[PDB]
Amino acid sequence: DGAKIYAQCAGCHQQNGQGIPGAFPPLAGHVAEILAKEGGREYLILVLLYGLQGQIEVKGMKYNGVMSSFAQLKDEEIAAVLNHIATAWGDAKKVKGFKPFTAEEVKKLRAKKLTPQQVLAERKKLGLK
Numbered sequence: 850d851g852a853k854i855y856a857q858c859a860g861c862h863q864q865n866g867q868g869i870p871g872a873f874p875p876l877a878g879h880v881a882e883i884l885a886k887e888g889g890r891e892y893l894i895l896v897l898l899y900g901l902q903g904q905i906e907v908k909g910m911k912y913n914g915v916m917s918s919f920a921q922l923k924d925e926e927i928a929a930v931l932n933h934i935a936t937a938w939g940d941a942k943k944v945k946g947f948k949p950f951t952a953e954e955v956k957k958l959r960a961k962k963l964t965p966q967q968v969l970a971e972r973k974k975l976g977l978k
């Protein structure tokens with residue numbers, strides 16, 4: 850399930866999803882912020898498929914690291930971990946009528962390979978600083 854896949858994330862983003870200041874952004878309380886944006890859910894898929902780099906802001910704090918791609922995970926595994934990060938800490942409550950992630954959303958986005966630099970560009974397209 851989603852919780853089991855999340856073990857591959859917890860070393861950085863932590864068991865409680867709160868991250869580590871300066872090093873690894875929080876997911877708890879922050880996934881809702883991303884989901885609130887038009888293109889937010891697609892963006893979360895792109896991070897897992899293609900990784901991320903560059904300076905970003907989360908809860909007013911700056912991060913300047915690199916996340917690897919997790920494209921070795923199957924479409925259903927990516928859908929599962931994304932549902933875990935959306936629900937484990939109540940981020941999906943804040944979002945009106947949240948539909949769970951599904952394999953076909955990941956499949957669709959696997960069809961157009963991006964670089965981590967392009968993923969950052971996508972994040973900025975959301976209105977996120």
Ligand code: HEM
Pocket residue numbers: 854855857858859860861862872873874876893896897901902903904905906907912913914915916917919930931934972
């Ligand atoms: C499948 C497991 C993982 C998931 C679901 C996950 C989730 C995410 C998400 C959703 C973001 C975007 C946050 C934002 O744009 O505000 C992100 C960024 C980031 N993640 Fe992960 N992550 C995972 C594994 C890891 C691991 C293992 C590491 C450590 C090696 C890591 C380090 C980072 C870093 C450093 C960033 C920010 C990149 C930057 O500063 O530009 N992640 N992660």
